[PDB]
């Protein structure tokens, strides 16, 4: 079993000062095996924090990230699953399904993770799985009407991934779970 934290669009410190305290309390160092970050940290402070949580941290370049050297996209394999990672500001219209499906095929991944919209998504489409963790800080963006903080945790064993979404609803954390199987 491999636990994979998925998060991004924190926008610390220009839009938000910190991760929500109850999210931070959930992330105990050593518990999680892999971290996949969609970008827009936007400073080294947040990268240092993720490195205190896990030994394998991946991050792609957001459109506000100070570190322009983060790769623009990444493919990581965890167990039986090949996973694609991109921030998503490059896709116009934002979140466009046909464009994300084209990315899925070109990366040749079972799961495609993107961000940028600050809207959590977790869904299957033509026998592939698509995840957007939303914004872990609830950072505003150009469009949306104030944002619920969220992050995702993938629980991977054999050919099954159980995707958990954590949301800060008012002042309390609530969860939802979705199962996916490699066909």
């Amino acid at each position: 079993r491999m636990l994979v934290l998925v998060l991004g669009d924190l926008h610390i410190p220009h839009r938000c000062n910190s991760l929500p305290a109850k999210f931070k309390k959930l992330l105990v160092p050593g518990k999680i095996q892999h971290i996949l970050c969609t970008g827009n940290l936007c400073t080294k402070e947040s990268y240092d924090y993720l490195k205190t949580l896990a030994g394998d941290v991946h991050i792609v370049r957001g459109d506000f990230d100070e570190n322009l050297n983060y790769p623009e996209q990444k493919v990581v394999t965890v167990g039986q699953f090949k996973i694609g990672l991109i921030h998503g500001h490059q896709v116009i219209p934002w979140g466009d399904m046909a464009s994300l499906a084209l990315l899925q095929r070109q990366f040749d991944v079972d799961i495609l993770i993107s961000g940028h919209t600050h809207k959590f998504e977790a869904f299957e489409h033509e026998n592939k799985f698509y995840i957007n963790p939303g914004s872990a800080t609830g950072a505003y963006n150009a469009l949306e009407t104030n944002i619920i903080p969220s992050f995702v945790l993938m629980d991977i064993q054999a050919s099954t991934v159980v995707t958990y979404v954590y949301q800060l609803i008012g002042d309390d954390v609530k969860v939802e779970r979705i199962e996916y199987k490699k066909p």
């Binding site: 518990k31 945790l153 629980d155 969860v175």
Partner: peptide
């Protein structure tokens, strides 16, 4: 356990 986002119940989670 944590409460579910939608509905009334609770869900076990890995953290």
């Amino acid at each position: 356990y944590l409460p579910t986002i939608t509905g009334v119940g609770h869900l076990w989670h890995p953290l």
